[PDB]
């Protein structure tokens, strides 16, 4: 079998870079049961607070590289190095919310605290995996801490998420709001679960500071090689709903959710 | 002597820098406002942003055919292949323009996305002889070219009635009345002066939402504009009824001399 480019850009020109799709595995055509969007959408009344006078903002007249930047101080510090990468010291167990600079700040649009709002810069590819359906892989080396993409979809309420039948694309922001990428989503809806993940989600605020709606940004948690599949840990809660339907195919020696890992735990509980 | 007093009054928010110069007097770069590249809110406007309420096209091409719903909503698509308004465009009573949006099936680079792609022409903020600050072209600009949007603070009818200074107040004009006030928050368009012989015209456009209470205001050149020419639109007789005009045209109808006659 031969690899087959089946779409030049699944984003239809909406991202900074094209995101091609290939399938060198089976006969599945390019996925089209969803609407690609590059930014979050709403399908009910949400009234995101966008009052420009409500925004916390900085007075910096440099590039916001100093510890005096207010937006960095709201994040405890700015966690971006000079190349726009997330610092290794960033705490994954208890991450602070990231507050990027915004339209109320006195700084320029190219200051050092605007990584996520500047969008996708790495070359990604939608591709057919051997055992998980569609997936996303890197077409380049990606250093640790690099911004990858945002989890984009339909903003819905807690109550609406209870009503939704399919939560295979439902991200819990943790009233409680979620992002459902089932019907509307970006490239992130195709990122699979890995028990040994190489990206992590981070909560970020940019052009609004409405605390019901953090945006979810994925950053690499280690150096990523060309061709390597991207994935994050969906979390035990997702698997406590979903392992009755399918089991994990990540194949890692550390896999916590495989058919066998579940059976081994069940046999320890019996013994 | 002409001094450059700002490399970019937009602070990097537009596609191009917009420098400011002064070769007339001692006035420094204007700083009594906040530059913003898109409209802002200072109170709850409840703009309908429901993606399922958008009318949108099913175009599998570049939206240059007559089956594009978004062009049909605008009577036709009025943009030529270069993104300029057609010569047949009603420059006196323009129709509403519906550009393609996030619900359309077309690509982001189809032919119906001129205003949402932002400023392309090179402009300069500069100190005029008699009108304070103004905006001029640093290049020739063909007729029908998109210049910039009138950007500011969205305010209600009642809020506009309470405001003291309407020198930056654009009336969006059935239904609830709203205004764009660029006094406190605005982009480069807040500096465009009135001309009785204008060379740009405002056009109402819809892009990412279709809440008909809140058209966005796009300025297009109404004729070929020469390099160095000051940009201006006709503020309208209502503004002048509710300083005297220094436009200098032989057709100026708001001058001190005109008002006295
Ligand atoms: C820095 C942040 O760290 C995080 C945060 C979140 C994650 N992981 C997830 O969010 C996970 C994502 C699954 C992939 C398909 C997208 N999805 C879920 O847990 C999930 C949970 C509950 C649920 N149901 C209801 C929820 C609310 N109200 C009512 C019902 C649906 C899905 C990882 N790291
Ligand atoms: C759509 C294309 O057609 C148009 C439309 C409008 C224009 N021209 C103007 O909009 C004009 C703009 C003046 C320049 C300084 C910005 N401004 C005004 O008429 C104006 C009117 C009333 C007012 N006051 C209140 C209003 C409501 N409620 C309370 C008070 C303030 C300003 C030209 N062509
Ligand atoms: N580690 C995994 N093992 C098996 N299936 C997975 C795994 N991670 C994701 N999936 C599958 O992908 C769904 C989640 C999607 N967000 C990911 C894109 C999906 N692979 C697709 O082809 O559309 C899950 O409901 C599973 O069907
Ligand atoms: N044709 C004109 N003649 C005299 N003054 C004008 C004319 N057009 C605009 N102005 C002045 O500019 C104001 C409108 C502003 N939106 C334009 C920018 C203004 N020139 C400034 O320096 O900030 C008016 O209140 C007038 O002060
Ligand atoms: Zn700062
Ligand atoms: Zn900044
Ligand atoms: Zn800031
Ligand atoms: Zn696993
Ligand atoms: Zn179309
Ligand atoms: Zn289109
Ligand atoms: Zn369209
Ligand atoms: Zn005049």
Curated annotation (Swiss-Prot), chain B:
<feature type="binding site">
    <location>
        <position position="59"/>
    </location>
    <ligand>
        <name>Zn(2+) 1</name>
    </ligand>
</feature>
<feature type="region of interest" description="Interaction with histone H3">
    <location>
        <begin position="235"/>
        <end position="238"/>
    </location>
</feature>
<feature type="binding site">
    <location>
        <begin position="193"/>
        <end position="194"/>
    </location>
    <ligand>
        <name>S-adenosyl-L-methionine</name>
    </ligand>
</feature>
<feature type="binding site">
    <location>
        <position position="168"/>
    </location>
    <ligand>
        <name>S-adenosyl-L-methionine</name>
    </ligand>
</feature>
<feature type="binding site">
    <location>
        <position position="100"/>
    </location>
    <ligand>
        <name>Zn(2+) 3</name>
    </ligand>
</feature>
<feature type="binding site">
    <location>
        <begin position="131"/>
        <end position="133"/>
    </location>
    <ligand>
        <name>S-adenosyl-L-methionine</name>
    </ligand>
</feature>
<feature type="binding site">
    <location>
        <position position="63"/>
    </location>
    <ligand>
        <name>Zn(2+) 3</name>
    </ligand>
</feature>
<feature type="binding site">
    <location>
        <position position="57"/>
    </location>
    <ligand>
        <name>Zn(2+) 1</name>
    </ligand>
</feature>
<feature type="site" description="Histone H3K9me binding">
    <location>
        <position position="150"/>
    </location>
</feature>
<feature type="binding site">
    <location>
        <position position="63"/>
    </location>
    <ligand>
        <name>Zn(2+) 1</name>
    </ligand>
</feature>
<feature type="binding site">
    <location>
        <position position="252"/>
    </location>
    <ligand>
        <name>Zn(2+) 4</name>
    </ligand>
</feature>
<comment type="similarity">
    <text>Belongs to the class V-like SAM-binding methyltransferase superfamily. Histone-lysine methyltransferase family. Suvar3-9 subfamily.</text>
</comment>
<feature type="domain" description="SET">
    <location>
        <begin position="121"/>
        <end position="236"/>
    </location>
</feature>
<feature type="binding site">
    <location>
        <position position="57"/>
    </location>
    <ligand>
        <name>Zn(2+) 2</name>
    </ligand>
</feature>
<feature type="binding site">
    <location>
        <position position="100"/>
    </location>
    <ligand>
        <name>Zn(2+) 2</name>
    </ligand>
</feature>
<feature type="binding site">
    <location>
        <position position="104"/>
    </location>
    <ligand>
        <name>Zn(2+) 2</name>
    </ligand>
</feature>
<feature type="domain" description="Pre-SET">
    <location>
        <begin position="55"/>
        <end position="118"/>
    </location>
</feature>
<comment type="function">
    <text>Histone methyltransferase that specifically mono- and dimethylates 'Lys-9' of histone H3 (H3K9me1 and H3K9me2, respectively) in euchromatin. H3K9me represents a specific tag for epigenetic transcriptional repression by recruiting HP1 proteins to methylated histones. Also mediates monomethylation of 'Lys-56' of histone H3 (H3K56me1) in G1 phase, leading to promote interaction between histone H3 and PCNA and regulating DNA replication. Also weakly methylates 'Lys-27' of histone H3 (H3K27me).</text>
</comment>
<feature type="binding site">
    <location>
        <position position="245"/>
    </location>
    <ligand>
        <name>Zn(2+) 4</name>
    </ligand>
</feature>
<feature type="binding site">
    <location>
        <position position="70"/>
    </location>
    <ligand>
        <name>Zn(2+) 2</name>
    </ligand>
</feature>
<feature type="region of interest" description="Interaction with histone H3">
    <location>
        <begin position="157"/>
        <end position="174"/>
    </location>
</feature>
<comment type="subunit">
    <text>Heterodimer; heterodimerizes with EHMT1/GLP. Interacts with GFI1B and WIZ. Part of the E2F6.com-1 complex in G0 phase composed of E2F6, MGA, MAX, TFDP1, CBX3, BAT8, EHMT1, RING1, RNF2, MBLR, L3MBTL2 and YAF2. Part of a complex composed of TRIM28, HDAC1, HDAC2 and EHMT2. Interacts with UHRF1. Interacts with CDYL. Interacts with REST only in the presence of CDYL. Part of a complex containing at least CDYL, REST, WIZ, SETB1, EHMT1 and EHMT2. Interacts with PRDM9 and CDYL; interaction only takes place when PRDM9 is bound to hotspot DNA. Interacts with SMYD5.</text>
</comment>
<feature type="domain" description="Post-SET">
    <location>
        <begin position="243"/>
        <end position="257"/>
    </location>
</feature>
<feature type="binding site">
    <location>
        <position position="247"/>
    </location>
    <ligand>
        <name>Zn(2+) 4</name>
    </ligand>
</feature>
<feature type="binding site">
    <location>
        <position position="246"/>
    </location>
    <ligand>
        <name>S-adenosyl-L-methionine</name>
    </ligand>
</feature>
<feature type="binding site">
    <location>
        <position position="68"/>
    </location>
    <ligand>
        <name>Zn(2+) 1</name>
    </ligand>
</feature>
<protein>
    <recommendedName>
        <fullName>Histone-lysine N-methyltransferase EHMT2</fullName>
    </recommendedName>
</protein>
<feature type="binding site">
    <location>
        <position position="106"/>
    </location>
    <ligand>
        <name>Zn(2+) 3</name>
    </ligand>
</feature>
<feature type="binding site">
    <location>
        <position position="196"/>
    </location>
    <ligand>
        <name>Zn(2+) 4</name>
    </ligand>
</feature>
<feature type="binding site">
    <location>
        <position position="110"/>
    </location>
    <ligand>
        <name>Zn(2+) 3</name>
    </ligand>
</feature>
């Amino acid at each position: 079998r031969t690899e087959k480019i089946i779409c030049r850009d699944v984003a239809r020109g909406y991202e900074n870079v094209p995101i091609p799709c290939v399938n060198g595995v089976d006969g599945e055509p390019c996925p089209e049961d969803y609407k690609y969007i590059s930014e979050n959408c709403e399908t009910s009344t949400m009234n995101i607070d966008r009052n420009i006078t409500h925004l916390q903002h900085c007075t910096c007249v440099d590039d916001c590289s100093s510890s005096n930047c207010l937006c960095g101080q709201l994040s405890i510090r700015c966690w971006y190095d000079k190349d726009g990468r997330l610092l290794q010291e960033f705490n994954k167990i208890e991450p602070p919310l990231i507050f990027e600079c915004n339209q109320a700040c006195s700084c320029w649009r190219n200051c050092k605290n605007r990584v996520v709002q500047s969008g996708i810069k790495v070359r990604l590819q939608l591709y057919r995996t051997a055992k998980m359906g569609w997936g996303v892989r890197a077409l380049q080396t990606i250093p640790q801490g690099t911004f990858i993409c945002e989890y984009v979809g339909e903003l819905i309420s807690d109550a609406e998420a209870d009503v939704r039948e399919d939560d295979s694309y439902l991200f819990d922001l943790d009233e409680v709001y979620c992002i459902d990428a089932r019907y509307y989503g970006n490239i992130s809806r195709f990122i699979n679960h890995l028990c040994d993940p190489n990206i992590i989600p981070v909560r970020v605020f940019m052009l609004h500071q409405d605390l019901r709606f953090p945006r979810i940004a994925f950053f690499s948690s280690r150096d990523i090689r060309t061709g390597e599949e991207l994935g994050f840990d969906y979390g035990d809660r997702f698997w406590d709903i979903k392992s009755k339907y399918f089991t994990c195919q990540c194949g890692s020696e550390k896999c916590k959710h495989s058919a066998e890992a579940i059976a081994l735990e069940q046999s320890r509980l019996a013994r």
